[PDB]
Amino acid sequence: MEPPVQVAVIGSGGAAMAAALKAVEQGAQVTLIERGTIGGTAVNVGAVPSKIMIRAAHIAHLRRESPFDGGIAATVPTIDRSKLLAQQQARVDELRHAKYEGILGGNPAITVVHGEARFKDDQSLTVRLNEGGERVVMFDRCLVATGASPAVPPIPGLKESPYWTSTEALASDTIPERLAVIGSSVVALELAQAFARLGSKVTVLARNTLFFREDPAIGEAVTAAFRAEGIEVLEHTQASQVAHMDGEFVLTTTHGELRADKLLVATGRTPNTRSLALDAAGVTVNAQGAIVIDQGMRTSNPNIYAAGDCTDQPQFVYVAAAAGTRAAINMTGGDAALDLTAMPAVVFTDPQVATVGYSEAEAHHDGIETDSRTLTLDNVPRALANFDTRGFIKLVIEEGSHRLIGVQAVAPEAGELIQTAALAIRNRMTVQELADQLFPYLTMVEGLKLAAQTFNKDVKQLSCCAG
Amino acid sequence: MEPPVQVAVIGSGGAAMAAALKAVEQGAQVTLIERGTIGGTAVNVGAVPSKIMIRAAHIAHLRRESPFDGGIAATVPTIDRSKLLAQQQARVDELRHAKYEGILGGNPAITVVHGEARFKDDQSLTVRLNEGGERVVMFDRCLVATGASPAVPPIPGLKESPYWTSTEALASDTIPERLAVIGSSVVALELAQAFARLGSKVTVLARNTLFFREDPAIGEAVTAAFRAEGIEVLEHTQASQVAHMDGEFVLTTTHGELRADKLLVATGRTPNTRSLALDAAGVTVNAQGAIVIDQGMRTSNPNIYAAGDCTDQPQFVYVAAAAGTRAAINMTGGDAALDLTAMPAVVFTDPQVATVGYSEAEAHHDGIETDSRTLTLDNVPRALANFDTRGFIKLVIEEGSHRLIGVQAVAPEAGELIQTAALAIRNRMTVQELADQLFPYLTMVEGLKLAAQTFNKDVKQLSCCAG
Numbered sequence: 001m002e003p004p005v006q007v008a009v010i011g012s013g014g015a016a017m018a019a020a021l022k023a024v025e026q027g028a029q030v031t032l033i034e035r036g037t038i039g040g041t042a043v044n045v046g047a048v049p050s051k052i053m054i055r056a057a058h059i060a061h062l063r064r065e066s067p068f069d070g071g072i073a074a075t076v077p078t079i080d081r082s083k084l085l086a087q088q089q090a091r092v093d094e095l096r097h098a099k100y101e102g103i104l105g106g107n108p109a110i111t112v113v114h115g116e117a118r119f120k121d122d123q124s125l126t127v128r129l130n131e132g133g134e135r136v137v138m139f140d141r142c143l144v145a146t147g148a149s150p151a152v153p154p155i156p157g158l159k160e161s162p163y164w165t166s167t168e169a170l171a172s173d174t175i176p177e178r179l180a181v182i183g184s185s186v187v188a189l190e191l192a193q194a195f196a197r198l199g200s201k202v203t204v205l206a207r208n209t210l211f212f213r214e215d216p217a218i219g220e221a222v223t224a225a226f227r228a229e230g231i232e233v234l235e236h237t238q239a240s241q242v243a244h245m246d247g248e249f250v251l252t253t254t255h256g257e258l259r260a261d262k263l264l265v266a267t268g269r270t271p272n273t274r275s276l277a278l279d280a281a282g283v284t285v286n287a288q289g290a291i292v293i294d295q296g297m298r299t300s301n302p303n304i305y306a307a308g309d310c311t312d313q314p315q316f317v318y319v320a321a322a323a324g325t326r327a328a329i330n331m332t333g334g335d336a337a338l339d340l341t342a343m344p345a346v347v348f349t350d351p352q353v354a355t356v357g358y359s360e361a362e363a364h365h366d367g368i369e370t371d372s373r374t375l376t377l378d379n380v381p382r383a384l385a386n387f388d389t390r391g392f393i394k395l396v397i398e399e400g401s402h403r404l405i406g407v408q409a410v411a412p413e414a415g416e417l418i419q420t421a422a423l424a425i426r427n428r429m430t431v432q433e434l435a436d437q438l439f440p441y442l443t444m445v446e447g448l449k450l451a452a453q454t455f456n457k458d459v460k461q462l463s464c465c466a467g
Numbered sequence: 468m469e470p471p472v473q474v475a476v477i478g479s480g481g482a483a484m485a486a487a488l489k490a491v492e493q494g495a496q497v498t499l500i501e502r503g504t505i506g507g508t509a510v511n512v513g514a515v516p517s518k519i520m521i522r523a524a525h526i527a528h529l530r531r532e533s534p535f536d537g538g539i540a541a542t543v544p545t546i547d548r549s550k551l552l553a554q555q556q557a558r559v560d561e562l563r564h565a566k567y568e569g570i571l572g573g574n575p576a577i578t579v580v581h582g583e584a585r586f587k588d589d590q591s592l593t594v595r596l597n598e599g600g601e602r603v604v605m606f607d608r609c610l611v612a613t614g615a616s617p618a619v620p621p622i623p624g625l626k627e628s629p630y631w632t633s634t635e636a637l638a639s640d641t642i643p644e645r646l647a648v649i650g651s652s653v654v655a656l657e658l659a660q661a662f663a664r665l666g667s668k669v670t671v672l673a674r675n676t677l678f679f680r681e682d683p684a685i686g687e688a689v690t691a692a693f694r695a696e697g698i699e700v701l702e703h704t705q706a707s708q709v710a711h712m713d714g715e716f717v718l719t720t721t722h723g724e725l726r727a728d729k730l731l732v733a734t735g736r737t738p739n740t741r742s743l744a745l746d747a748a749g750v751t752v753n754a755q756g757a758i759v760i761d762q763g764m765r766t767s768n769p770n771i772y773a774a775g776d777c778t779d780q781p782q783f784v785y786v787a788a789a790a791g792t793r794a795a796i797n798m799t800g801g802d803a804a805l806d807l808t809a810m811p812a813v814v815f816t817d818p819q820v821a822t823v824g825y826s827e828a829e830a831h832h833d834g835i836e837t838d839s840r841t842l843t844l845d846n847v848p849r850a851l852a853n854f855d856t857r858g859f860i861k862l863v864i865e866e867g868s869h870r871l872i873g874v875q876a877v878a879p880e881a882g883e884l885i886q887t888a889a890l891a892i893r894n895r896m897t898v899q900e901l902a903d904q905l906f907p908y909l910t911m912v913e914g915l916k917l918a919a920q921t922f923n924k925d926v927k928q929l930s931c932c933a934g
């Protein structure tokens with residue numbers, strides 16, 4: 001009779017949870033090791049609390065102003081951040097219980113160990129237990145799903161100052177009068193706008209332009225939107241010194257001296273791999289410290305897998321979970337691979353950013369010949385009816401085949417409409433085929449159809465829902 | 468040398484516009500006859516003004532209340548309906564110019580005639596001109612695209628009372644203190660909620676239940692939502708007498724006497740065909756007065772076509788436009804057919820209703836064996852993060868193949884997510900295939916994936932974005 005496979009999982013985030021559950025489903029016995037709070041980043045200090053805070057911010061903003069203020073009075077709402085934080089935290093705590101702790105605890109084929117794991121060799125871990133002492137965890141296969149942590153640039157004075165990462169910002173019980181933000185990508189900008197809408201005077205120090213690594217139309221639209229609601233965006237601006245004196249931050253910058261009550265540093269994340277003794281198990285990392293893996297999540301050691309933010313994978317919980325599931329399949333004798341060809345991504349600013357597939361520049365880099373169309377939102381009936389035409393929908397096609405290969409959008413509800421684009425790309429549709437489908441009038445997603453139609457004719461001279 | 472085909476178009480709405488433009492593109496000479504305002508229903512008195520008013524209502528509602536009121540103060544906003552109406556009307560007038568009048572006037576192959584057309588015979592019309600007298604319009608082919616008008620039930624006292632249809636409601640410059648609504652489908656309920664949110668005390672007299680012809684889960688959710696925000700929904704209630712006395716409506720009902728300042732009657736629409744002398748051209752109508760057509764929009768007379776609300780077609784401007792385009796193709800020697808298999812539909816209540824493909828009941832009626840899953844919105848991360856879990860997402864599949872054949876949703880942004888469902892149905896995807904696609908976390912559209920996963924496993928015991 002053959003014994004259950006012994007699977008060790010390091011972490012308890014989206015990747016680890018998916019792996020643990022799939023491994024048990026496949027008949028393995030799981031030992032899961034977590035050094036901090038169960039659930040990792042998405043539930044505790046990431047996606048969930050951030051989206052809640054952004055929704056609160058949206059309501060505050062719309063109470064302050066709207067495109068219908070000519071006929072609907074607005075007021076500046078009083079904000080009780082203590083109550084908002086309590087509400088936010090209760091949902092976080094509830095979800096941690098329901099989807100993480102309750103699922104791990106209610107399964108007898110799973111042992112949770114509260115401690116910090118490192119590799120002893122290629123078939124065992126040593127765990128420094130949170131209650132002191134150690135245990136050894138022997139395994140047949142191991143998944144490393146240790147995630148990442150906020151990166152901190154070596155700006156003089158920053159290290160010893162009382163600055164915030166996303167964690168401390170989300171956990172804060174007060175809205176600061178003045179918030180400085182160093183960074184210019186999704187964490188910085190999601191949180192900058194939320195804090196601004198909840199009452200902070202926000203200044204963003206962007207070392208280049210916003211969303212510098214994305215199609216430049218994205219940063220252009222987001223920058224304009226931010227400035228329109230009173231967020232200061234200092235482009236090509238870095239702080240050379242941080243100080244905290246007489247109860248406030250003092251930043252020395254290329255733009256002059258800036259003062260603020262709180263400072264958010266949102267300058268990327270780094271993989272959590274330095275405490276793992278990966279060399280002891282022959283697990284290779286890249287120049288950023290990320291664990292190198294193939295499409296099956298296999299490391300340089302055949303019995304060790306890695307998934308999620310501790311690898312080079314896109315840092316989205318749906319990617320981490322998908323990777324964990326497939327790692328578990330492979331740890332239990334299967335043959336699975338992760339396909340990210342139609343992976344959507346959403347930035348929860350207002351307007352939202354959403355992308356899927358190739359930008360023009362990404363396609364060019366991969367040797368693909370392209371064409372594109374960029375439909376400004378003043379051509380989308382829904383945006384016109386809302387009297388808010390900030391943004392655009394951009395479609396990228398392969399030349400010759402006219403297959404849709406990418407979409408980038410800046411729009412309210414961009415995160416909803418992007419999934420239609422994602423399915424169109426998955427199903428290898430041409431823009432003509434997409435345009436010939438019926439879309440509902442006066443929805444944002446109708447903009448995909450209208451953009452697709454501009455490859456053939458002028459949408460300006462097209463009648464209502466022609467197609 | 469062969470002459471341009473002479474195409475007559477009756478109407479100037481979505482169907483007529485699409486046809487006129489396509490006919491010219493195909494080398495025909497168009498004579499378009501319109502008795503009233505250019506643009507017909509969607510732009511002037513339908514979709515556009517209604518969606519604007521509903522958006523205004525949404526802002527008013529969120530200024531009044533939200534799930535975040537524990538930490539964000541709310542006020543009752545003053546509403547200036549004169550300013551809101553002016554804003555609404557300016558957008559209507561702008562769009563009529565841009566997409567209808569400017570397009571017709573700027574094309575020399577198009578003659579617009581201001582008058583009421585009827586058939587003289589099967590190759591000509593007589594037009595009663597708005598400025599008096601008549602002209603004859605000879606044609607080789609004719610498209611009838613005359614739309615529909617609000618239906619009015621023969622309730623004693625109603626005919627001679629100063630009641631509203633959707634037209635008068637949308638054009639009103641004041642929000643009535645008390646609004647009674649007779650009707651229980653999309654027009655009644657879209658407008659009931661908009662008026663309620665803008666300040667009216669609204670009472671809906673529904674002769675059966677809300678959305679009686681739809682999957683019963685829809686009406687159940689909408690009814691609960693309406694009651695939750697103080698709209699009275701009187702089910703199985705009809706008015707047997709209308710009177711207008713001492714400046715108010717007095718309705719005699721099965722629920723007792725009801726009084727209101729204004730009365731909206733929203734009890735369907737009827738095709739505009741009685742003034743057409745259709746018998747003179749051998750064009751057959753059905754028992755409702757709708758012009759009978761095939762999938763190519765051809766009537767009983769081979770030289771006459773019909774499209775839009777004057778037929779039995781679904782009354783959506785995107786259907787009318789698609790039908791008009793294809794009628795024009797067929798009028799100019801082509802072979803086109805309209806496929807409504809993946810036709811989405813959206814109700815702009817809050818939460819929205821959206822449907823595509825078959826309900827369980829519709830599938831059963833067509834001999835299709837089905838299974839289904841209904842995911843309540845308290846399982847959707849986005850809804851949880853918004854602290855608003857009103858609604859559900861329901862998926863209908865064919866048994867055996869597991870092909871997705873229908874989706875019904877009641878949710879905020881249901882109209883956006885429904886298009887992903889529409890494409891999945893177009894591409895003949897199984898629920899397993901849909902579930903294995905990556906969706907963005909904390910979007911409403913993620914609910915489609917989560918619902919799809921419940922055909923295989925319990926979503927309650929699934930970890931974050933497992934899949």
Ligand SMILES: Cc1cc2nc3c(=O)[nH]c(=O)nc-3n(C[C@H](O)[C@H](O)[C@H](O)COP(=O)(O)OP(=O)(O)OC[C@H]3O[C@@H](n4cnc5c(N)ncnc54)[C@H](O)[C@@H]3O)c2cc1C
Pocket residue numbers: 010011012013014015016033034035036037038039040041042043045046047048050051115116117118145146147148166187272275276307308309310314315316317318320348908909
């Ligand atoms: C502010 C913010 C907002 C975000 N918003 C979104 C969003 O809207 N949508 C989205 O899809 N994604 C979002 N993300 C990203 C998402 O949170 C991550 O991509 C995802 O949570 C990564 O999951 P994971 O399983 O790889 O790692 P994690 O969830 O980070 O879990 C790793 C776990 O391993 C533990 N650990 C590490 N080392 C050891 C060790 N040696 N021994 C024991 N335990 C260890 C850690 O304590 C941690 O609990 C956001 C992230 C942040 C920071």
Ligand SMILES: Cc1cc2nc3c(=O)[nH]c(=O)nc-3n(C[C@H](O)[C@H](O)[C@H](O)COP(=O)(O)OP(=O)(O)OC[C@H]3O[C@@H](n4cnc5c(N)ncnc54)[C@H](O)[C@@H]3O)c2cc1C
Pocket residue numbers: 441442477478479480481482483500501502503504505506507508509510512513514515517518582583584585612613614615633654739742743774775776777781782783784785787815
């Ligand atoms: C309140 C309301 C809200 C709506 N909301 C939406 C929505 O959100 N989304 C959506 O897709 N659809 C919506 N609709 C439906 C949409 O407006 C219609 O389905 C669409 O406009 C029909 O277009 P059509 O071309 O068939 O007819 P119409 O646009 O009605 O045009 C018919 C034209 O023919 C003219 N005419 C009639 N008889 C004659 C004659 N004998 N001679 C000359 N001219 C004549 C009329 O004056 C009219 O201008 C809504 C409708 C209403 C009433």
Ligand SMILES: NC(=O)c1ccc[n+]([C@@H]2O[C@H](COP(=O)([O-])OP(=O)(O)OC[C@H]3O[C@@H](n4cnc5c(N)ncnc54)[C@H](OP(=O)(O)O)[C@@H]3O)[C@@H](O)[C@H]2O)c1
Pocket residue numbers: 153154182183184185186187188190206207208209211212213238266267268269314315316345346347348
């Ligand atoms: N909605 C979501 O899905 C979501 C939400 C939050 C986080 N996340 C994920 O979590 C990860 C972390 O996000 P992130 O926004 O922190 O990082 P990121 O997207 O990796 O971007 C790095 C940011 O740091 C800046 N930067 C780096 N070093 C700097 C320095 N020395 N000085 C000033 N600026 C510096 C970069 O500027 P330049 O671009 O100019 O180099 C850029 O703005 C990302 O993968 C992100 O997608 C996702």
Ligand SMILES: NC(=O)c1ccc[n+]([C@@H]2O[C@H](COP(=O)([O-])OP(=O)(O)OC[C@H]3O[C@@H](n4cnc5c(N)ncnc54)[C@H](OP(=O)(O)O)[C@@H]3O)[C@@H](O)[C@H]2O)c1
Pocket residue numbers: 620621649650651652653654655657673674675676678679680705733734735736781782783812813814815
């Ligand atoms: N968002 C959109 O796409 C949109 C918006 C507006 C309109 N439209 C379209 O325009 C058309 C008209 O919509 P509509 O809502 O007026 O009609 P509808 O959807 O055809 O529904 C008819 C309504 O009238 C009721 N009714 C009929 N006779 C009645 C009587 N004698 N007494 C009381 N109630 C009576 C019906 O009740 P029962 O159901 O109980 O019989 C039902 O509520 C529809 O095709 C609609 O889809 C679409």
Ligand SMILES: [Hg+2]
Pocket residue numbers: 441463464465466481784785788
């Ligand atoms: Hg349209």
Ligand SMILES: [Hg+2]
Pocket residue numbers: 014317318321908930931932933
């Ligand atoms: Hg998730």
